[PDB]
Amino acid sequence: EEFRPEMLQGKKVIVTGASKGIGREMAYHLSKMGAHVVLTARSEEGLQKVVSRCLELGAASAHYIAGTMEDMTFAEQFIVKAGKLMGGLDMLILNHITQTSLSLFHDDIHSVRRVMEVNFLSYVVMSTAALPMLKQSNGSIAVISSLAGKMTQPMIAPYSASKFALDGFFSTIRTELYITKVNVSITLCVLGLIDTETAMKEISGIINAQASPKEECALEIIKGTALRKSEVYYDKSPLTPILLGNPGRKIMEFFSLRYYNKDMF
Template structure:
């Protein structure tokens, strides 16, 4: 016991010292005033709510998604809420050329970029994996490769501004969940790419922050339609989730967890009791309702 204390007490001291040293300032909405921000997947769900929060904070916005009519409505609402400016470009992120085009539009329309929020996802199914390799490949194009393409295109502007990259991911990119195999694969890929890129930025003294956002079950229309009658845990509100993502990006946090306690406890179990976590996850589904789909 004495030896254990000799190890644990200095270790605890180091952890506390690091926590105090790395503590960030409190979030203030004015941090985003006048900032030039791209938000992808902004016609609905979390992306739409992020656009509204940023508009209220006085940001310059360029939003993108597939549906022109929905984007027009979001832009109009952003201007009503006080955005410094709000514009949109519509198209599909299945084509990495479009992803690069969005960044070029930001350069022309906004004159630079302070924050790149990558939030879009391609459509997938919520069911047992059907063995369709082509679907996995297509989803990787949208959920992963377009993120890479936009990041690469945005790096010159972000280096100039000392800006931020915010990557909206999921618990399905940290832990294996059933019924989301293709989706989960793309989210794990995001974690690997952006966590490694963050390390290279540190080695090269590149002043760009990367915030990876680990989300649980959120009450977006698409998530509720796909899984509300199967997942037994209550969904969290997309409005609050969107604000937490923005706060994390503005404070240049390494990772954002929403909701925090649930996500952190699950990650702790993943590292110390993986079999128990797997068992608890399997108990969170109504398989009878799944079979009815």
């Protein structure tokens, strides 16, 4: 099956971490496709600015609810509100991350808790809150991850821990939805280094690799999620999906189901 921008015309989409970077670009692409969009981040001003441009780009409707994903009550309330604002949900885009700087791990335990809370726990809170709505529309979740969520690199231990945690959790949920015959798709988006100002600022003088453009990245996520793919790899090397693909895991995953009591689902 091939992608059509028509697939997102009139769809009700949530985009977290939408005030800058990849999130803002997804907001923009979704608007040009004519979707109903509800955006979130902490910066009320930044969200206001992107909602304006969204309406201008051709968004069916554009809403925002500012807040921190450090608060689990906020994370779940946000979904309920957004769902009411659009009268449903077709696609949930879990994209925000808490701030992290490249550092050889030393003793920041409070940073590690904040990373797990924002980058991991909030995503499970929101997916659980959005699932009844998504079950109705036969919807989709896009879980934004990284190469650091499939492999390891120095100076990003807490971050890598959170992206790995998302893979572990959402891959279990995906399998669970499939075996219970629930038509809700889960797309884990494995991203390489991207053009975002925050990313580029963070790596400066530490990492030398070339970054991919944020606009193309945002579109590849949307396309992949719309096409209901389990995984999307977006990175400069075409070797990355073959190297990180892990068909061995896929074989083990399929074969292991033979030991489960089918009555459980």
